[model samples]
Target: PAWQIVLWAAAYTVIVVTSVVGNVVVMWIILAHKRMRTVTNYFLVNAAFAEASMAAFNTVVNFTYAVHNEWYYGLFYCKFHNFFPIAAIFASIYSMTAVAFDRYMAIIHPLQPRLSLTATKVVICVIWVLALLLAFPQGYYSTTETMPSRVVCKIEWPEHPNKIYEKVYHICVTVLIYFLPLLVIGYLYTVVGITLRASGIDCSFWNESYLTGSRDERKKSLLSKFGMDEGVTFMFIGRFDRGQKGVDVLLKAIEILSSKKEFQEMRFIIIGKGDPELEGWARSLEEKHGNVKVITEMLSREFVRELYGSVDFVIIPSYFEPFGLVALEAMCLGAIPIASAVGGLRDIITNETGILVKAGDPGELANAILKALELSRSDLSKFRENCKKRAMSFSEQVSAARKVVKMMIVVVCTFAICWLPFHIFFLLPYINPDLYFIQQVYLAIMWLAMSSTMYNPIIYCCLNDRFRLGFKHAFRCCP
Candidate 1:
């Protein structure tokens, strides 16, 4: 054990010393030598800072902790211990992404404003400020928690603001670190390749083209619709199931929202077929409203896909929804989901993902629509990724089937637990009529058995996550 400790120390000491000596010298070459101070060397500067800081702050402390397998260093170092390493990694990745972007722009957009020495200096400053801001939370929330024979430094997320702050934090970091670099480098390299391939061709004697095979493969936008290139697109999807699906409510909301001059230019597309009564209503609604378009048949998948792509918002005004499946499916296409705050819809449509309104309230739905419409294009664009994230988080068919079985079990168990004993109690009276207690128990049991069956169909028919959540609101019944 003593010999192992000594060996570990020796190995880590060499690494730490070399990392510091090597990077610092490289940085000195760029900073001290006028010839070496180039734009490419600016990236080298960031790399040096990242390497030196990693060695100085984290490498030594991490090695120390690994050897001891305990927290000999207290809380203050714990904050630095968590903060410095993350800050280094974030800064390293962000700098790489920025540098890649810089190179890409140089090649692809040759005429564009280039990164000057002064601009690079400003950018480098900005990058550190952003990096520090990104790492600020880690330092703020980083704390030491007692464990057996050790204390560990980790994020101590409080539950006031959001329950899953830690989960969201890690997801954002993962996406930023991995996807950001991958997308930036991938796109830059692809464009560079395209440019390189085209460089051989020019004002030569040959009259064919600058591009041949790929040029022929260029996509053509053939199928154009009338009145398509217009204002902000809005939509309502799924069946108009009388008052329950809120087709009527949406018509009223649109009418209410239309009274505002701001919404007059907005195009509303209502899709899906319903009963004859609802169909007639929808026809009347289109006639009554200026910008309303209603399609009375189920659209093909390709058409539906294109429709969602074209639209800005998807509205669901269900009277009593089990789970708003249509809203989730549409949201996956990056169409923002707006629905009534009832049942499972509440679980899916957080404020970040979509907007929610009071059930069956046209005024509230109108206000929500107005609010979403009033949002700046820049603000609305941010929700697109969140919409996709929310929609994709739940698996489609397979998970739905699996959840159904589990949900049904809970449904059955709950019903059985509440009524099965009474059924048994009722049967005892017939087996032993002379028993005095049996007669009274028989009447009670009979009533329960008869009444429980009457409610089963109505109760279980509405079985969904929202159906379960609706129990909290069951007593009220007003909405």
Candidate 2:
């Protein structure tokens, strides 16, 4: 029972420390930076503040009260212990609600005026006012009682004999704090989806990639469409997702380049399908310009490789690329990449091999593209050779083997460290036959060894990106 209490205490301590530190850091990051002080980030700051306050003020006190079943602190804390959590919960949820509405408006009505800083602050203040109002009754009714055995604190509702008022109040609280907000946020997002779909922007592309039966026909058509092309060809082969892959940014860059005389002669090939709005926009660009071609279907690997070899350059303007396989694939086929200078793309693309520009900046990307076009035939050939040589270093077999060896070493070392004491303790009895070991000491050593199982998952989560994402998804609903 003592060990169980210790475990629970440790867990609670971790929760409190992590919540406070993480939320404070979030608040500081948003508030301290001018660029990060957006309307949505303001709401996030409110939510983070509420969470940090609740964790700091309530967690240990509540734990103590729960464990002892006694009110050690007097009436003020008794009232605060009951009052603050409800207010914090209300504020936090409402802040999230504000964010949902803000996003809905931004997406569904892109031309509409957004909330200004003053208006956003007023809304947050109003939320806190409502939260305090809702929490007032609980605080006002809180009282402490001392019995012969111990002390207890609880709410003493008016007209307690009927119990009807308490029931109605509880139902109202539940609906207002939990059910109603969830329903509103859910309905808003649903409508946002519907509105976007109605405007030819489909969100369904986030999940599955559709494959049609017209692969060869489509390839032949594409070849015929671009037959005898007499200009530098730039290809983009990825999803049309705007958030990470930044296809929207590329589209904007193309739009910016459309009016330029030099770019008018260049060819653009867009492959892959996603986000119906983007696909539709790309099609419109194709119709508007003879140099641009849009292909919405998934192509075979061989066809993709062939395109990679034929294309002069591949454009990757991801906002944040984790591991840019597209860049690597293009590089392997001697197609120089003009990619964003972020994430894995940073390591993949160099000035000699390809070009790197700011992520999510269409102007910068357009400039980079123009710069790439200015390279002489001899320089372009040299860059192509460099690209292939750089790509060879990222060979799958070499990287996979390196990763496997590193992970094996880490795991074996962890296991050895954890169990070394356990094995040493076991051998001590053989060395001293008359020595006696305490049961608790033996159990402690056994637990330390057994904790190796727990460390393995933690190690994996720390070292592996996919594992970290999987763990986050698995525990997404925890808090």
Candidate 3:
């Protein structure tokens, strides 16, 4: 018995410290940041405070009672101790109720942003007042007394009306504390489930033919025209800040080309804004070479579109590039590109359409510039024919991908809605014991919940033509 008491005290000490320290940090994080003080986060912080406050005061007294099986504490200590614990539980219950209602309003009616900071504070304050009102009778009625062999602490109700008061209090505690909160939680989730399901129903759903026809109808344009009247011209675009855009390497390539007599007729147009340090490097080079033009001022889209037609090639010699959209836009305008073969650049620039060289190599880029200077009219025309077909493939894949993304979002939402009924069923019995038979079939309901994960792939296949088409192609290749 002594060993058990020691073990219980050790375990209770952990609970005491965890509830205090963990919740205090949660409150500090939420209060410290302006962005984190959302309506839901406010409720969460209040719940933490309630749990921590409940544990901080009651833990030592409860452990003492457990080890001795007697209330050695006085009557005054018993009254307030019982009162605060009841009030703390009420605060915790109402805080969760606030969170559930907030979620329901957010999902169901998004335009109406209810619960401002002032309103949330008022509600939290009201919760504490109501909790104190419910718990005041415990402090007034509780007392400590000596039984046959030990001391005890309990409510001291008396007379003919005492039994009726006890019954009424029990009813109030159950209705206010337990069943009322659970009912609201169940009702809010049920409406959310209904709303999510209704949002997914569409006229074109389950019609793969409509999806395919819709994908084909949205036609994106292919190319733009250009008149190259000057000696072989080269263009470089985008940010020129140090290593991010490799502005230094672009300057190095130009310096190397200036010495070679083969590229004497080539003119380079570098159009982008860079940092002060990089701009200084660019300005020094422009003074050194007569053919190099560095335009730091930003131009309009219409002007840039027309400018792309005048330039012969677009260069993106970035130390790092993601998709290299500048290179793709250049290819769309019939300007050949010379880019570093890095992330997303390899997908767009093929060997036939552009030149892919090792990044940061000034020698390779200078040699590539000379090759462009030597190309004849017939060689430039051949690159366009291959570029047109490749650009069209990208347009088709992007259009189809948008439809697949919509299908995946609907599938995930439906999967969550389908399993809400099982949890809701578990919640309903707390309102009344007459509904306890629902738990008897919990196994059946749980199995149905487990089966919700299988719906996503099926929904995607049914609603998306590209997914089904790929599936069929996979089966065709198998045997």
Q: Which order, best to worst by lDDT?
A: 2, 3, 1
Rate residue 306 of model 2 by lDDT.
68
Better of 2 and 3 by TM-score: 2
After superposing candidate 3, which stretches have Cα over 4 Å from the reference? 1-229, 376-378, 420-479
Please give the clash total of every predicted structure, in order: 2, 0, 0
What TM value does model 1 have? Answer: 0.39
Could you give candidate 3's per-residue lDDT for residues 261-332 as a string of tens digits? 865577677778868877777788777766667789988865565545546677888888754556655666
lDDT of 2 by residue, 134-190 (tens): 988888889898775678898889766777776566667766766687678777666
Off by over 4 Å in 1: 1-10, 148-150, 160-163, 197-479
Candidate 2's C-alpha runs over 4 A off are: 147-149, 193-479
Model 2 pairs whose backbones collide: none
Q: What is the lDDT for 408 in model 3? A: 36
Task: Write down the worst ten-residue block by lDDT for model 2.
Answer: 200-209
What is the per-residue lDDT of model 1 for residues 55-163, given as tens digits with 9 covering 90 to 100? 6666667666655556767888888886765566566556655655665676556578977888887887887777677777778887888764567776687866654
Q: Model 3 has how many clashing residue pairs?
A: 0
